[PDB]
Design a protein around this motif. Structure first.
Motif, PDB file in Angstrom:
ATOM      1  N   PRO A  66     -11.483  17.169 -11.800  1.00 29.88           N
ATOM      2  CA  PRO A  66     -12.128  17.359 -10.492  1.00 29.88           C
ATOM      3  C   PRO A  66     -11.153  17.410  -9.329  1.00 29.88           C
ATOM      4  O   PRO A  66     -11.416  18.121  -8.351  1.00 29.88           O
ATOM      5  N   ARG A  67     -10.032  16.697  -9.405  1.00 31.79           N
ATOM      6  CA  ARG A  67      -9.162  16.489  -8.253  1.00 31.79           C
ATOM      7  C   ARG A  67      -8.337  17.720  -7.884  1.00 31.79           C
ATOM      8  O   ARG A  67      -7.594  17.678  -6.899  1.00 31.79           O
ATOM      9  N   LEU A  68      -8.477  18.833  -8.602  1.00 27.79           N
ATOM     10  CA  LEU A  68      -7.652  20.000  -8.304  1.00 27.79           C
ATOM     11  C   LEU A  68      -8.110  20.694  -7.025  1.00 27.79           C
ATOM     12  O   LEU A  68      -8.509  21.863  -7.051  1.00 27.79           O
TER      13      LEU A  68
ATOM     14  N   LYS B 139     -12.581  14.868   1.301  1.00 29.03           N
ATOM     15  CA  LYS B 139     -12.594  13.441   1.572  1.00 29.03           C
ATOM     16  C   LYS B 139     -13.981  12.981   2.011  1.00 29.03           C
ATOM     17  O   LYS B 139     -14.780  13.748   2.553  1.00 29.03           O
ATOM     18  N   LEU B 140     -14.259  11.705   1.761  1.00 35.60           N
ATOM     19  CA  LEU B 140     -15.523  11.119   2.180  1.00 35.60           C
ATOM     20  C   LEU B 140     -15.606  11.082   3.700  1.00 35.60           C
ATOM     21  O   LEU B 140     -14.622  10.788   4.385  1.00 35.60           O
ATOM     22  N   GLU B 141     -16.788  11.393   4.229  1.00 34.36           N
ATOM     23  CA  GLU B 141     -16.982  11.408   5.672  1.00 34.36           C
ATOM     24  C   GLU B 141     -16.806  10.002   6.245  1.00 34.36           C
ATOM     25  O   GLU B 141     -17.318   9.034   5.677  1.00 34.36           O
ATOM     26  N   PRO B 142     -16.094   9.866   7.358  1.00 34.82           N
ATOM     27  CA  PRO B 142     -15.879   8.544   7.954  1.00 34.82           C
ATOM     28  C   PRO B 142     -17.193   7.928   8.394  1.00 34.82           C
ATOM     29  O   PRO B 142     -18.144   8.649   8.726  1.00 34.82           O
ATOM     30  N   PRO B 143     -17.292   6.599   8.392  1.00 36.18           N
ATOM     31  CA  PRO B 143     -18.563   5.954   8.742  1.00 36.18           C
ATOM     32  C   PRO B 143     -18.926   6.210  10.197  1.00 36.18           C
ATOM     33  O   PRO B 143     -18.057   6.256  11.069  1.00 36.18           O
ATOM     34  N   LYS B 144     -20.220   6.375  10.451  1.00 30.53           N
ATOM     35  CA  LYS B 144     -20.695   6.582  11.811  1.00 30.53           C
ATOM     36  C   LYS B 144     -20.747   5.260  12.563  1.00 30.53           C
ATOM     37  O   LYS B 144     -20.952   4.199  11.972  1.00 30.53           O
TER      38      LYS B 144
ATOM     39  N   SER C 280      -1.389   7.870   9.532  1.00 28.23           N
ATOM     40  CA  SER C 280      -1.876   8.883   8.605  1.00 28.23           C
ATOM     41  C   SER C 280      -1.784  10.249   9.273  1.00 28.23           C
ATOM     42  O   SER C 280      -2.247  10.423  10.405  1.00 28.23           O
ATOM     43  N   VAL C 281      -1.191  11.210   8.574  1.00 23.80           N
ATOM     44  CA  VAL C 281      -1.034  12.556   9.108  1.00 23.80           C
ATOM     45  C   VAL C 281      -2.159  13.458   8.614  1.00 23.80           C
ATOM     46  O   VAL C 281      -3.152  12.984   8.065  1.00 23.80           O
TER      47      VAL C 281
END
Lengths: 183, 116, 64, 232, 541, 52
Positions: free
Chosen positions: C34-36, C41-46, C63-64
Motif C-alpha cells: 500500500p505504501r507505494l 497522510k491523515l487529515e489533521p484534527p479539527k 517538519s518540512v
C-alpha cells in the motif's frame, strides 16, 4: 462560516535539537583516558555506527548512528554512566563538517544557518531499525532482509549471522581477558 | 557486559540444577540468574527496585527537550461510566497551564563545545 | 464487502432509471504494497475556531 | 512451624468463622504430573480427608483438573498448600516423599483460575492478558509456610462469586485443550515455514523489485550521508 | 442435478481447494476460493440449499481459524449469517471475533454495537454492553465513532438526561482525534441552559458554591447571575480544551501523522522501516504515560500491522515483566505470539527463560518434548543453529536437575550424559554441513576437573584425533580448545601440564596444517606460554 | 458431512496420526474425499524432502 478550522503552527527554525532527522549524539565530559575504540565498544550495542570521533584534548566525542531510534535509545540508556571514572552527559549535536562551518560562521557571526540531515527516502521495506549484523533467504517478513555493514555497504542478512555473533563474542571474551584489547 | 551476561547464562544453564537455582532465587531483589541476564541485556542502569517531576515523564515524546506538560490532577478517564453515574463528577483540577508555550533545552553541545 | 455499503449483506438488498463503484471481486493481490505513494497522510484534527489562539505557537519539531 | 496441620489449627483459631462455605464458589487448578503412581498416592491421602463431594478430579484423555466447588475458606488453604507443596517437591527434594510435611526453604508457587463473574471489591495478584477467555487467572508468589495461608485467608475472605453456570467446568476443559492444541500446532509449523506451506515461488517474483529498489535507496543514502559528513 | 452437487462436481472447485490446501498461509487462494463459493450461490436467501449454506459456513470458519486477525471477514461472516435469518449465531460469531482480539478492536466493537442496537431491544443489557465496550476500546485515538454511537443511543433512549451529562463529562477529557466535535456539543448544550437549577446537572451544589462561587438557590434577579455562571463554566471548559488540545496535537504531530497502515493484511506483507520506528517510539511514549488500559489498547493496536515481526511481542513481554511485574502475563503473551511470529527463535528463548523463572518445570519439559518431536526426534540435525542451542541448554539444565551426578565433587554431568552426548556427537559427525561445530567444541571444553577432563579428552578429542577428520584437524580453534582444556585443569601440576602439552599435543598435528593452525596456536602461546614460544616456532619451520 | 472432509497439511507433514478428521478444528482445510489421493500426491515431494 464554520467553527472548525485546521490548526496552523510556526516552525522552530531547525536547530540541532528540533531536527527530527538528527542521529548524532554529542558525548561530553570524557576523562581523556578513553580512545575511539573503547568509545565505539561502549556505544556499539545500541545500533550501527557511521563514525566515531574524539577531538584531541576537547574532552568530548561524537557518535553518528544510522537510526534515530538507536540514538534515542543510546541517550536514554547511557546517561550518567561513568566512562573512565568520569560521569557522562549525553545530548544531541552535529557532525564534524557542520561543526567547523558553525565555528567559522560564529567567528564571522554572519548567518548561523543549519542544514537538515539527509533522510532515508521512504518507503524502505527491507530494513528493521535498531538491528545488528556482523557477517537461502526467502525474504519473509519475520527475518531482517537487509542490513548495514559494520565499518560501508549493504548486505543481505543470512541465517548464519547468529552463529557468527556468538563466535565473535566468545573470541573477544577469550582474547580480551588476556588483554589484546580493552574493548 | 553483554558478552559476560550471555556466557554466564549459558554456563549456568549447562552446569547448574534446579535445586541450586531455587536456593539462589530471592524475591526481595527479584534476581533470578536465568531471566535477569535476559532483562539486563542492553540496559546498563537496569535496577529491579509523583510520576510527573521526573525526567522520563518530562521528555517522553521527544528526547533532549524537556517541557512541562499540562495535565488534569484528578483525571476520570480511568473510571468507567457505570461507576461514574454514581455521584456527580467533580470539576477538574489543573496543573502546568502557564507552561504550555515555554519550552527549555539544555544546550550542552553549544555550551560546552562551541563556547567551551 | 463491508464499507462499500452497496455489497453489504444486510441492506444490500435495496441497492441490488437512475460512479466507479468498488466491486466485490477485489482480491488482496491488488496493491500488494500500500505504501507505494498511493495513500495520503491523515487529515489533521479539527479545532474550534473561536479558540484558535489557544493553540501553541510553535511545534516541537521542524517538519518540512 | 512448617507443618500444615499446625498452621491449619492456627488459622482456624483466629480467622473469624472460616469454616463457613462461600455461596456458589468455584476454583479450578489444572496441574500436570510426570509420575502417576506417586501423585495418585498423594491424591488418595488428600481424598481421605478432603471428602469426595468438595474436591474432584477429571483426568483429561497427562493433565489433572483439580476442581473445588462450594469450598470452605479453611479447606481451600489446606488443599492448595498440599497440592502446591507436592507439585514443587516433585523436583526439589524427590527423596523425602513426605506429603503433609513441607520442608523448609521451599517457596510455594502456582496458579489457579476463577470464574470471570467475580468482583474484587499483596502476594496474590490477578494477571493481565489471560489466554483463557472466560476465566480469570491468578498467581501465587513468595510464600513461606504461614504467609501463604494468611494471604489466602485475606484474599478469599474478600472476593465473592455469583451464579455459576451448570457446566462451566466442561467449557474450561474444552477451552484449555483448544489453546494448548493451538500452541502445539504453532510449534509444529516451525520447520515448514520456507516454501513448505507459503507459496514462496510466487511470493519472491512479487517481492524482488521492492527489495532491489530498497537496496539502491540504502546505498544512495549511505553515499549522501558520507558526503554530508566529510569536509573533503 | 442440484446446485450443490453441480458446484461440487465442477472442476474449478477442485483446483481452488487444492491451491488452498497446498498453500494455507497465502490468503490470496483463500480469498479467491471464498469469493468463488459465495458467488456460485447466486441467490442468498432462507430457501437455498442447506448443504451449500453449511459449506459456506465451514469455509468462512476455516479461513477465520487460519487468519485470526481479519476484522473485515469476521464482520462479513456475521452479516451473512444475519442475512440468513438467525441472529444467535451472528452474536456468537461477533463474540468469537472479539475474543480473537482480546476484546480490543475498534472496528469490531463499532460494527458489533451498530448491529446490537437494532437487535437487543433491552435497555439494561444494551447499556451494559456499551459500558463493557467503553472500558476496553474507549481510549482509542480514533474512537470518535464509538462515542458518537453511545451519545446518540443515550439521547434517543434516556429521558432523565443526567446520563448524557455524566458521559459527555468523561468524553471531554479523553484525547480523541475528534475532541472538537464533543467540545462543540458541550458548549452548545451549556449555552442552551435556561435556569439556575439545571446547573446541578453539571456538578454538585457544594462544588459549585465552593469552587466557582456560584449559588444555585440564588433568588432575586437571575438573568445576569445565570449569565455569570455560563461565563465561568465556559472559562473552565476553555481550560479543559487547552489541556486536551495540547495532548492531541502533540500526539498527532509526533506519532500519528507518520503511521499509514492500521490493518492486518496477510502473512506475506512487508511493513516499512519508518512505520516500524514510529510504532516503537509511540509504544514507548504510551508506556511512559502510565495508563494500563491505554497501554494495552495501544499494544493490541500495534499488533495489527506488524504481528508477524515479533519485536512488538518481545517489547510487550518485556514491559509486562519489568514495569507491571506480571510473569504470568508475559508467559501468556509469548505463548500467544508463538502462534503468530515467523521467527520464533527469540520468542522461544525468552519463553524458556520466563517459564524457568515462574518455577513451572513440567511445562518446560513438555515444551522441550514438543520441540524435539517437531523435528522427528532429529533436532541434532536442524539447519538453524539457534533452536538447537537453546534446546540443548535447557534440556541439559533439566537433565542435571533430574539425574544425580555420576562424577566426583558434585560436578554435574552437563553435556556428558549419554542422552545429550549422543546428539552432540551426531551433530559433530556432519563436520561441514552444520554451523555450530566450534561453538559446541568450546562449550564442551569447560569442565575443569581431573576425571571430567579425562572423560572429555578420551571421548571427544582423542576420538577425533584417531579418526583424522581434516576439517577439524586443520582448524586452529580446535587445537586452541584442546590446549585450553588441558591447561586450565586444576588437578595437573604446572610442570605436568606444560610437559603434556609440549610433548604430546603439538607433535600430534601435521605440519601441512601449519599455515592455518599457526594463528590461534601462536595466540595461545603469546597469552600463556611465552617461554615455549621458541620451541613452537622452531618445531613449525 | 457429505463429499467434504477436513485435512490439515501441518499435522500431516509432522507425521502425526490425526491429520484427517470430519470435525471442523483450528488449522483444518476442506477437501473433496474423491480427491484426497491427489492431495497426498501434491505434498509428496516436500514430504520426501523432509524424510531425506
Amino acid at each position: 462560516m464554520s467553527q472548525f478550522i485546521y490548526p496552523v503552527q510556526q516552525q522552530p527554525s531547525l536547530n540541532h535539537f528540533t531536527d527530527p532527522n538528527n542521529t548524532t549524539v554529542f558525548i561530553g565530559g570524557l576523562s581523556s583516558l578513553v580512545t575511539e575504540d573503547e568509545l565505539r565498544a561502549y556505544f556499539q550495542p545500541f545500533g550501527t555506527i557511521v563514525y566515531v570521533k574524539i577531538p584531541v584534548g576537547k574532552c568530548c566525542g561524537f557518535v553518528q548512528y544510522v537510526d534515530r531510534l538507536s540514538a534515542e535509545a543510546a541517550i536514554a540508556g547511557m546517561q550518567g554512566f561513568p566512562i573512565a571514572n568520569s560521569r557522562v552527559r549525553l545530548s544531541w549535536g552535529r557532525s564534524a563538517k557542520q561543526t567547523a562551518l558553525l565555528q567559522q560562521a560564529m567567528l564571522s557571526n554572519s548567518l548561523q544557518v543549519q542544514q537538515q540531515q539527509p533522510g532515508l527516502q521512504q518507503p524502505n521495506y527491507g530494513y528493521i531499525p535498531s538491528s545488528t549484523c556482523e557477517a537461502s533467504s526467502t525474504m519473509l517478513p519475520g527475518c531482517q532482509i537487509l542490513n548495514y555493514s559494520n565499518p560501508q555497504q549493504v548486505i543481505m542478512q543470512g541465517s548464519e549471522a547468529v552463529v557468527n555473533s556468538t563466535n565473535a563474542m566468545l573470541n573477544r571474551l577469550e582474547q580480551g581477558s588476556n588483554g589484546f584489547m580493552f574493548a | 557486559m553483554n558478552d559476560i551476561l550471555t556466557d554466564y547464562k549459558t554456563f549456568y544453564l549447562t552446569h547448574s540444577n534446579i535445586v541450586t537455582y531455587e536456593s539462589s532465587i530471592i524475591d526481595s531483589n527479584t534476581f533470578d540468574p536465568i531471566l535477569y541476564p535476559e532483562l539486563k541485556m542492553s540496559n546498563p542502569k537496569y535496577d529491579p527496585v509523583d510520576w510527573h517531576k521526573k525526567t522520563e515523564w518530562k521528555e517522553a515524546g521527544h528526547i533532549g527537550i524537556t517541557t512541562e506538560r499540562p495535565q488534569i490532577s484528578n483525571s476520570i478517564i480511568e473510571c468507567n461510566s457505570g461507576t461514574l453515574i454514581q455521584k456527580p463528577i467533580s470539576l477538574p483540577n489543573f496543573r502546568n497551564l502557564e507552561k504550555i508555550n515555554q519550552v527549555k533545552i539544555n544546550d550542552l553541545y553549544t555550551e560546552e563545545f562551541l563556547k567551551e | 464487502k463491508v464499507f462499500v455499503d452497496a455489497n453489504r449483506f444486510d441492506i444490500g438488498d435495496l441497492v441490488k432509471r437512475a460512479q466507479t463503484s468498488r466491486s466485490r471481486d477485489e482480491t488482496c493481490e491488488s496493491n500488494p504494497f500500500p505504501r507505494l505513494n498511493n495513500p495520503k497522510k491523515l487529515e489533521p484534527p479539527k479545532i474550534l475556531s473561536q479558540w484558535s489562539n489557544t493553540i501553541p505557537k510553535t511545534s516541537i519539531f521542524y517538519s518540512v | 512451624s512448617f507443618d500444615i496441620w499446625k498452621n491449619l489449627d492456627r488459622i482456624r483459631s483466629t480467622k473469624k468463622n472460616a469454616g463457613q462455605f462461600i455461596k456458589g464458589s468455584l476454583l479450578i487448578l489444572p496441574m500436570r504430573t510426570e509420575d502417576k503412581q506417586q501423585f495418585d498416592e498423594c491424591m488418595d491421602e488428600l481424598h481421605k480427608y478432603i471428602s469426595k463431594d468438595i474436591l474432584r478430579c477429571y483426568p483429561q484423555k497427562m493433565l489433572f483438573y483439580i476442581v473445588l466447588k462450594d469450598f470452605n475458606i479453611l479447606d481451600s488453604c489446606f488443599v492448595l498448600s498440599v497440592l502446591l507443596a507436592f507439585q514443587k517437591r516433585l523436583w526439589m527434594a524427590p527423596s523425602e516423599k513426605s506429603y503433609f510435611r513441607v520442608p523448609k526453604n521451599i517457596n510455594l508457587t502456582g496458579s489457579f483460575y476463577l470464574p470471570k463473574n467475580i468482583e474484587t471489591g499483596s502476594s496474590i495478584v490477578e494477571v493481565g492478558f489471560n489466554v483463557v477467555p472466560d476465566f480469570q487467572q491468578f498467581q501465587v508468589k513468595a510464600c513461606h509456610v504461614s504467609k501463604f495461608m494468611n494471604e489466602l485467608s485475606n484474599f478469599f475472605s474478600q472476593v465473592e462469586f455469583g451464579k455459576c453456570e451448570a457446566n462451566v467446568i466442561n467449557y474450561f476443559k474444552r477451552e484449555y485443550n483448544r489453546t494448548y492444541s493451538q500452541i502445539s500446532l504453532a510449534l509444529y509449523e516451525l520447520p515448514l515455514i520456507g516454501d513448505g506451506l507459503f507459496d514462496i515461488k510466487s511470493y519472491i517474483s512479487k517481492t524482488r523489485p521492492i527489495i532491489e529498489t530498497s537496496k539502491a535507496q540504502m546505498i544512495k543514502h549511505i553515499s549522501e550521508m558520507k558526503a554530508y559528513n566529510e569536509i573533503s | 442435478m442440484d446446485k450443490y452437487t453441480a458446484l461440487i462436481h465442477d472442476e474449478n472447485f477442485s483446483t481452488l481447494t487444492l491451491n488452498v490446501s497446498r498453500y494455507p498461509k497465502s490468503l490470496a487462494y483463500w480469498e479467491k476460493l471464498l469469493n468463488y463459493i459465495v458467488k456460485a450461490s447466486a441467490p442468498i436467501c432462507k430457501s437455498t440449499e442447506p448443504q451449500l449454506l453449511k459449506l459456506i459456513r465451514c469455509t468462512y470458519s476455516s479461513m477465520l481459524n487460519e487468519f485470526p486477525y481479519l476484522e473485515n471477514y469476521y464482520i462479513d461472516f456475521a452479516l451473512l449469517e444475519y442475512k440468513l435469518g438467525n441472529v444467535s449465531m451472528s452474536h456468537k460469531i461477533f463474540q468469537r471475533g472479539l475474543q480473537a482480539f482480546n476484546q480490543r478492536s475498534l472496528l469490531l466493537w463499532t460494527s458489533y454495537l451498530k448491529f446490537c442496537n437494532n437487535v437487543i431491544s433491552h435497555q439494561k443489557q444494551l447499556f451494559k454492553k456499551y459500558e463493557t465496550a467503553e472500558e476496553y476500546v474507549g481510549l482509542h485515538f480514533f474512537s470518535g465513532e464509538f462515542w458518537d454511537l453511545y451519545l446518540e443511543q443515550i439521547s434517543s433512549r434516556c429521558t432523565s438526561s443526567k446520563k448524557y451529562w455524566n458521559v459527555l463529562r468523561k468524553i471531554l477529557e479523553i484525547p480523541l482525534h475528534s475532541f472538537s466535535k464533543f467540545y462543540a456539543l458541550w458548549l452548545q448544550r451549556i449555552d442552551d441552559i435556561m435556569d439556575l437549577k439545571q446547573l446541578s446537572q453539571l456538578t454538585s451544589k457544594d462544588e459549585l458554591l465552593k469552587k466557582l462561587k456560584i449559588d444555585i438557590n440564588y433568588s432575586g434577579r437571575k438573568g445576569p447571575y445565570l449569565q455569570d455562571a455560563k461565563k465561568k463554566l465556559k472559562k473552565i471548559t476553555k481550560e479543559m480544551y487547552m489541556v486536551v488540545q495540547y495532548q492531541v496535537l502533540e500526539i498527532y504531530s509526533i506519532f500519528e501523522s507518520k503511521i499509514y497502515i492500521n490493518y492486518y493484511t496477510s502473512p506475506e506483507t512487508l511493513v516499512s522501516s519508518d512505520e516500524i520506528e514510529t510504532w516503537i517510539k509511540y509504544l514507548d511514549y504510551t508506556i511512559t504515560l502510565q495508563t494500563d488500559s491505554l497501554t494495552h489498547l495501544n499494544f493490541q493496536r500495534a499488533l495489527l500491522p506488524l504481528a508477524h515481526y515479533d519485536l512488538v511481542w518481545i517489547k510487550y513481554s518485556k514491559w509486562l515483566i519489568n514495569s507491571k511485574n506480571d510473569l504470568l502475563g508475559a508467559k501468556n503473551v509469548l505463548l500467544m505470539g508463538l502462534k503468530f511470529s515467523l521467527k520464533k527463535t527469540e520468542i522461544i528463548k525468552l519463553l524458556y527463560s520466563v517459564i524457568c523463572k515462574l518455577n513451572e518445570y513440567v511445562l518446560l519439559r513438555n515444551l522441550l518434548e514438543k520441540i524435539e518431536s517437531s523435528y522427528s526426534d532429529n533436532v541434532e540435525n536442524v539447519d538453524d543453529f539457534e533452536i538447537f542451542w537453546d534446546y540443548l541448554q535447557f534440556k541439559t539444565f533439566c537433565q542435571n536437575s533430574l539425574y544425580s551426578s555420576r562424577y566426583s565433587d558434585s560436578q554435574s554431568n552437563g553435556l556428558l550424559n549419554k542422552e545429550l552426548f549422543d546428539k552432540v556427537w551426531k551433530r559433530l559427525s556432519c563436520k561441514e554441513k552444520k554451523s555450530g561445530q566450534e561453538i559446541l567444541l568450546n562449550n564442551l571444553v569447560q569442565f575443569y576437573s581431573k576425571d571430567t577432563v579425562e572423560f572429555v579428552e578420551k571421548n571427544i578429542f582423542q576420538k577425533i584425533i584417531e579418526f583424522g577428520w581434516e576439517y577439524y584437524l586443520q582448524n586452529g580453534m580446535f587445537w586452541n580448545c584442546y590446549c585450553r582444556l588441558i591447561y586450565f585443569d586444576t588437578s595437573r601440576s604446572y610442570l605436568d601440564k606444560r610437559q603434556y602439552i609440549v610433548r604430546k599435543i603439538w607433535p600430534q598435528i601435521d605440519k601441512k596444517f601449519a599455515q592455518s593452525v599457526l594463528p590461534s596456536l601462536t595466540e595461545f602461546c603469546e597469552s600463556y606460554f611465552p617461554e615455549e614460544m621458541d620451541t613452537l616456532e622452531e618445531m613449525f619451520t | 458431512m457429505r463429499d467434504i472432509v477436513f485435512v490439515s497439511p501441518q499435522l500431516y507433514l509432522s507425521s502425526q496420526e490425526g491429520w484427517k478428521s470430519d470435525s471442523a478444528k483450528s488449522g483444518f482445510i476442506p477437501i473433496l474425499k474423491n480427491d484426497l489421493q491427489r492431495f497426498q500426491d501434491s505434498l509428496k515431494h516436500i514430504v520426501d524432502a523432509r524424510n531425506s
